[PDB]
Amino acid sequence: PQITLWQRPIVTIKIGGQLKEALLNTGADDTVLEEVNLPGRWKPKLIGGIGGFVKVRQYDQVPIEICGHKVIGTVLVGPTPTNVIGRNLMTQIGCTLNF
Amino acid sequence: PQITLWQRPIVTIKIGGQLKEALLNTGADDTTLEEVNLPGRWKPKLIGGIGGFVKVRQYDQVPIEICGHKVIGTVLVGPTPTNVIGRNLMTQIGCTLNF
Amino acid sequence: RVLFEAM
């Protein structure tokens, strides 16, 4: 699709067998989702860093469907004010900025 | 334009008579820049909100050149870890997400 | 990084 930016670019994703809403966020390096239970192995990752760090679980090569596109990428799972699709998954879906 | 997302989408802008670098950030509602001196009237705005609010100066209808596109929009001036072009100005330059 | 918004 072509998504204009007059509203926040929130899209439906399918992950860990659930439908969720997440923000397409070109200002975010990584994808962070809360309230999802992913199978298999993970390692802790420290993110944020201003005021302190937040510890999340990093899952690699996660199958995720973003707005219809089935892709694979790293998903960080942990508390987040809003679910965020970062650049790491936007590259996978072939998402570009255009003007 | 077409900007891919393998790296952070940092672009050159011209504002207040200076050349600056800023991040095209679809996750940001507003545009926040630091270390620019803008002429004329402003009003304080409280932004952020997690852990406290940050007070910035809101300047309306600021002429700004973003990647060669001369546009007009609100610029918040205040300290920010990265200069951020938010959706408010991305709409002005006609910037969309595409996949 | 990771940047969003909110007035």
DSSP labels for A11-79?
EEEEETTEEEEEEE-TT-SS-EE-S----S--EEEEEEETTEEEEEEEEEEEEEEETTEEEEEEEEES-
Dist CA B32 CA B88 (whole Å): 11
Dist CA B41 CA B25 (whole Å): 26
Q: What are the angstrom distances between the C-alpha of B86 and each of A48, A58, A60, B14?
A: 20, 28, 30, 15
Which of B57, B16, B18, B58 lies closest to B39 in space, CA to CA? B16
Give B38's Cβ-side CA count (13 Å radius).
Answer: 25
Q: Does domain A1-99 have CATH number 2.40.70.10?
A: yes
- Which residues from A are below 8 Å from B94, CB to CB? 99
Dist CA B24 CA A14 (whole Å): 26
Query: Minimal Cα distance from B26: which residue of C?
Result: C4
- Stated in angstroms to one decimal place, the resolution of this structure is 1.8
Tokens in use for A48? 């944020």
Specify which residues A73 forms β-bridges with: A62
B·C CB contacts under 8 A: 26
Interface test with B, best of A4, A26, A80 (most B CBs within 10 A): A26
Interface test with C, best of B23, B29, B89 (most C CBs within 10 A): B29
Instruction: Starting at the earlier edge strand, list the strands of the sheet with A96-98.
Output: A2-3, B96-98, A96-98
Dist CA B73 CA B62 (whole Å): 5
Question: Which chains reach chain A with 3 or more Cβ–Cβ distances below 8 angstroms?
Answer: B, C
Alpha carbon B65 to its chain centroid, in Å, reads 11
Q: Are B84 and B77 in contact (CB under 8 A)?
A: no
Experimental method: X-ray
Q: What angle do CA A98, A72, B10 make, to 5 degrees?
A: 30
Dist CA A85 CA A10 (whole Å): 9
